[PDB]
Amino acid sequence: IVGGYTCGANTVPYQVSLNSGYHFCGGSLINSQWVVSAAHCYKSGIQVRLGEDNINVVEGNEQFISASKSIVHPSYNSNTLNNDIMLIKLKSAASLNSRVASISLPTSCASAGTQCLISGWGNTKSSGTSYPDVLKCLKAPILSDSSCKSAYPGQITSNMFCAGYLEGGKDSCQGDSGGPVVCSGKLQGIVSWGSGCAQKNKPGVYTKVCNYVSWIKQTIASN
Ligand SMILES: [Ca+2]
């Protein structure tokens, strides 16, 4: 996250870290045994880390549970990033409290102009590399589809949206991928791609979760 603030320990209780010997992508806890992430984070051998604040210190609230199964969206296209969404089932159900909780799936798509919260452990610089060890948060608006398509001519599909600031300075960044964008207490986005971070006229691009709800629910019901 570039340009954001330190969330504070377990203030974002649905936020997960996907670990394969190291933190590589974020994710969102959607019920006790399922996590939603970005299809571009797919790896074999993922462990899910819940209850984290400082990913490099064991502080007391953590649950580390291996993934049993990972499902990439049937239509995921790695060259376009269209349908950049993945389901991970946990080997065991998580124990859900105030500090480890699931986030609700949306009923409606959120509109341009809505303010959302984006969080993760990604790079905090627009030029060069500096990874935080604690969880970083950004409030940012959803931009209009017009402003989005006009920043990224030819590249935006119906299953994406932009959010952030055309002036730059504040965005998501490398390592924040697969993490949540939550608006009005619902999961509306997944951190997916962008051109660099926090650059002028190159907002972050996010998977539009409200398009996938029927897919999510059907998959979870059957697996
Ligand atoms: Ca920790």
From Swiss-Prot:
Assembly notes: Interacts with SERPINA1.
**What is the UniProt remark on how the cofactor binds and its stoichiometry?**
Binds 1 Ca(2+) ion per subunit.
Q: Which residues form a coiled coil?
A: none
Residues engaged in binding substrate: 171-172, 174-175, 177
Q: Which cysteines are joined by disulfide bonds?
A: 7-137, 25-41, 109-210, 116-183, 148-162, 173-197
GO CC terms: extracellular space; serine protease inhibitor complex
Q: Which domain of life is it from?
A: Eukaryota
Q: Which family does it belong to?
A: Belongs to the peptidase S1 family.
Where in the sequence is the active site?
A: 40 (charge relay system), 84 (charge relay system), 177 (charge relay system)
The answer to whether UniProt assigns keyword Nucleus to this entry is no
Keyword Signal annotated = yes
- Its recorded name reads Serine protease 1
Indicate the segments forming the Peptidase S1 domain, all copies: 1-221
Which CDD domains does this UniProt record tie to the protein? Tryp_SPc
Q: Which residues cross the membrane?
A: none
What's one Pfam family here? Trypsin
What about PTM? Subsequent cleavage after Lys-125 leads to alpha-trypsin. Further cleavage after Lys-170 yields pseudotrypsin. A cleavage may also occur after Arg-99.
